[PDB]
Swiss-Prot record, chain B:
Binding sites annotated in the UniProt record for Mg(2+): D107
Known tissue expression: Widely expressed. Expressed in brain, with high expression observed in the corpus striatum. Also expressed in heart, placenta, lung, skeletal muscle, kidney and pancreas.
Disease: Intellectual developmental disorder with paroxysmal dyskinesia or seizures: An autosomal recessive disorder characterized by global developmental delay, impaired intellectual development, language delay, and early-onset paroxysmal hyperkinetic movement disorder that manifests as sudden falls or backward propulsion, eye or head deviation, and dystonic limb posturing followed by chorea and dyskinetic movements. Some patients may also develop epileptic seizures or only have seizures without a movement disorder.
Function: cGMP-activated cyclic nucleotide phosphodiesterase with a dual-specificity for the second messengers cAMP and cGMP, which are key regulators of many important physiological processes. Has a higher efficiency with cGMP compared to cAMP. Plays a role in cell growth and migration.
Consequence of substituting D221A: Decreased 3',5'-cyclic-AMP phosphodiesterase activity. No effect on 3',5'-cyclic-GMP phosphodiesterase activity
Domain notes: The GAF 1 domain functions as a dimerization domain. The GAF 2 domains binds cGMP, which acts as an allosteric activator.
Family: Belongs to the cyclic nucleotide phosphodiesterase family. PDE2 subfamily.
Organism: Homo sapiens (Human)
Resulting phenotype, Y237 to V/M: Loss of 3',5'-cyclic-AMP phosphodiesterase activity. Loss of 3',5'-cyclic-GMP phosphodiesterase activity
Domain PDEase: 1-312
Lineage of producing organism: Eukaryota, Metazoa, Chordata, Craniata, Vertebrata
UniProt-annotated binding residues for Zn(2+): H70, H106, D107, D218
Included stretch of the parent chain: 591 to 915 of 941
Superkingdom of origin organism: Eukaryota
Assembly mode: Homodimer.
Protein name per UniProt: cGMP-dependent 3',5'-cyclic phosphodiesterase
Length: 338, 325
């Protein structure tokens, strides 16, 4: 009630007022208090001129932002602060990379909105868990795959179909259909299996050179950009990436505990008795995150620093891995842990 | 107090002497000496023996491992060998008595540091003994002489000149034998004697057997259950790392096993068990088929270190759910 009232009547605060470094790749959006994030979303939308350009109703946009935020639960990693930080990176790509020379205005808008919605109602477990636990979400979507991603998309649509929240409701039939198709494609691209399926096509696109007149290049670029936002925690400083690791493994390990309770053997990365965090993170950096940011660098020369930071963080896991071995005694001078 | 009134399992190799309250240890020493009939057979004066025993206990300091409870545990194992191995078939009674007394006195006034550290820090003990080697072991012996020559503590004061001299010489050889350098020097000789067969009428065999038994008592914590060998490892490494910290402050570089930043406990303990402890209990087993269970416990304890080694690598998160370490 009161949150909506202040967003609506206080006016959209200037983006520069959030932090002097807010538009830099070195800014860490997790630094912003959660209570200030809904206004920051409106400030970013305004700074990208989407509110004016698409003549978005302000009461409707306020209601939509609050409803999207309210649509996240609170597991350790897949919560609203993740969606907010993913959306922020999308803003950073816009401000720093000149996306308008590559993408249509409506595609950029859809990317940002998709970022806000892309993990809606996440329950802290992955696609395989849905299927193994015979969840309602799997009853609905398992035959199509990307179970959680389909749910996230369905949740975004349900918000738009809530009276008072359809920020697109004045769009023409064609523009409305375009927006919803984009949101579908972008949200589904956050599944790893999807990314692995298109990786060679992404390589081929970077090799031949981006063609702005090629519809398929637009679609491929949107997928790559979405994935670069989803993984953007890795482009920050060491301290950020370390904290994020903690949150991700806490969540992964909770899942593994539930799998064990159902009589299943969890994947090693979900198994708190077998997971060795440094190797797992080095592998993620080397085999998944680094190639994504190397691709981004191939397409946007100004994205070079991003790849350099992810590479630097990968190096830091190597340097710190020796500390995971217990030399001497533990701090309590006891071998009670056996 | 008869030994059977202390615990029904007191004379068993399964008994853990460190279970006995420290306040009761002096009485258990008397009970053990009574059970071996040493007091009656050499006509020891009982108040003199009581005063001696309390002086010995008091002459130990309180580092984590080399304290009175170590000396008590070592001397209890000596008693266990007497009871379970029937030592009187192999050794003279006086050599048995000497061994037990040596076990009580063998680490007197230990400072929780090794010989190298005494020499490196230029302590008075190093000034006195470094030229002859075995610095701490010479001090332990000189402390024991000092006690015997304290008024009312000379348990050997009625002995014949011959027996008195024999006791002095045995205590010296046995305490000096507690040095690891000495043990490795005579190890081939120990193997030789075990190969050809122990000779009850060869005086050199008696000397060698006495050395081997002493080291077998000094390491006896490893012949107990896993819980005991785990606790004792904690004590040993707390003591070692404390010396290593001191060496680092003096500008020196500790051996790896005393460097808390470098030491990997499972590898060190496995190495100790495999290359030092097991060969000793194997020898003991070659000479006494009854000591077979001791070797077996040691080898089993060795295997347990390698089954728990993986726990020294942090998998998953720490308990606090944080990577703040
Ligand atoms: C070797 O394979 C992995 C190793 C480690 C992880 C854990 C992990 N997951 N992770 C994630 C995602 C998985 C992202 C998968 C992905 C999907 C599409 C495109 C690229 C990657 C978790 C939270 O679900 N985001 C980040 C920044 C990380 C991260 O730093 N680590 C996940 C792994 O595979 C999914
Ligand atoms: C690879 O070499 C070692 C590895 C580990 C140790 C530490 C250690 N020492 N230790 C000791 C003694 C050293 C015993 C040395 C010895 C002397 C005579 C005959 C055999 C061994 C420490 C406390 O000084 N007793 C025991 C039961 C242990 C023990 O379990 N571990 C010592 C080591 O060499 C001395
Ligand atoms: Mg997701
Ligand atoms: Mg000693
Ligand atoms: Zn996500
Ligand atoms: Zn000792």
């Amino acid at each position: 009630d009161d949150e909506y009232t202040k967003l609506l009547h206080d006016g959209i605060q200037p983006v520069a007022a959030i932090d002097s470094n807010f538009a830099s790749f070195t800014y860490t959006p997790r630094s912003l208090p959660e209570d200030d994030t809904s206004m920051a979303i409106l400030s970013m939308l305004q700074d990208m001129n989407f509110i004016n350009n698409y003549k978005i109703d302000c009461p409707t946009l306020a209601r939509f932002c609050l409803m999207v935020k309210k649509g996240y639960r609170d597991p350790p990693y897949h919560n609203w602060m993740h969606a907010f930080s993913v959306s922020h990176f999308c803003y950073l790509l816009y401000k720093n990379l000149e996306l308008t020379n590559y993408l249509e205005d409506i595609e950029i808008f859809a990317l940002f909105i998709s970022c806000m919605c892309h993990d809606l109602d996440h329950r802290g477990t992955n696609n395989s868990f849905q299927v193994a636990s015979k969840s309602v979400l799997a009853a609905l979507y398992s035959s199509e795959g990307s179970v959680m991603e389909r749910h996230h998309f369905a949740q975004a649509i349900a918000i738009l179909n809530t009276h008072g929240c359809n920020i697109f409701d004045h769009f023409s039939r064609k523009d409305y259909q375009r927006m919803l198709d984009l949101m579908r494609d972008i949200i589904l691209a956050t599944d790893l299996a999807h990314h692995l399926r298109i990786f060679k096509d992404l390589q081929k696109m970077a090799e031949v050179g981006y063609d702005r007149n090629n519809k398929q290049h637009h679609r491929l670029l949107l997928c790559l950009l979405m994935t670069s936002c989803d993984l953007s925690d890795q482009t920050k400083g060491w301290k950020t990436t370390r904290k994020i690791a903690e949150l991700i493994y806490k969540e992964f390990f909770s899942q593994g505990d539930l799998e064990k309770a159902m009589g299943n053997r969890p994947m090693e990365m979900m198994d708190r008795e077998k997971a060795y965090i440094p190797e797992l993170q080095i592998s993620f950096m080397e085999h998944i995150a680094m190639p994504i940011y190397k691709l981004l660098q191939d397409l946007f020369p100004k994205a070079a620093e991003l790849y350099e930071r992810v590479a630097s963080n990968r190096e830091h896991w190597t340097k710190v891995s020796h500390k995971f071995t217990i030399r001497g005694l533990p701090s309590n001078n006891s071998l009670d842990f056996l």
